[PDB]
């Protein structure tokens, strides 16, 4: 039930705010857009899809950087309430190049930089684009992960009121919810 991070060793100093900042700058804006989507591009994928998975993840078109979205994730694509995604939001992991699909065994990334599992999030179909999952992932395609640091800031302090965001990876090792993972 409680918020579990992970992080290259690389980040230990870094607190969870500076490095979410950085990441959605560096992985910037798709433009998943009307008359902007670009098939290849800027649609990303479902694993297993089409339109459903236990996985959606996609690449920046601006640098290497990647995300991982898991939990049990549902597109509405035209259908009411149009272009939503809902569902369970479990995980998302953030780093660079990434690989594999449905016939794979899942998405992985070759650099995965950090992680945020137990999420707990669960957003349902009558929400449409208000819904906290549609926010905190479409957050991470357009270049603003306000909605994944709210939420995380939230289940840390529901952890221990001392931690935040702006508690750094170690600081958050020490209390017992974040876990180093190897260096690239």
């Known amino acids: 039930m409680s918020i579990s991070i992970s992080y290259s060793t690389t980040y230990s100093g870094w607190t969870v705010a500076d490095y979410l900042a950085d990441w959605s700058a560096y ?12 098939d290849g591009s800027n649609t990303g994928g479902f ?3 089409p339109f459903d998975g236990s996985q959606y ?22 259908s009411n309430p149009s272009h939503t995604l809902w569902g369970k939001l ?5 780093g660079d190049t990434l ?11 070759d650099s995965q930089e950090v992680s945020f ?7 349902p179909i009558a929400q449409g684009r208000d819904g906290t999952v549609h926010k905190v992932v479409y957050g991470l ?32 090792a020490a209390a017992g919810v974040a876990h180093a993972t190897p260096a690239a």
């Not at 690449?59 to 509405?76: E, M, P, R, V």
């Not at 599992?117 to 957003?123: M, P, T």
């Open 57 to 78: 993840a996609l690449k920046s078109t601006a640098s290497d950087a990647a995300f991982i979205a898991g939990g049990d994730l549902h597109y509405t694509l035209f």
């Open 27 to 38: 992985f910037g804006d798709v433009n998943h857009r009307p008359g902007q989507v670009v």
């Open 141 to 172: 395609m357009s270049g603003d992960s306000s909605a994944l640091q709210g939420q995380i800031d939230a289940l840390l302090k529901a952890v221990d009121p001392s931690l935040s965001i702006n508690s750094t990876f170690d600081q958050l």
């Open 99 to 109: 690989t594999g699909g449905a016939s794979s065994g899942g998405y992985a990334l």
């Open 47 to 49: 694993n297993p899809g």
């Open 90 to 94: 479990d995980s998302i992991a953030l």
């Open 117 to 123: 599992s137990n999420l707990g999030l669960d957003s």
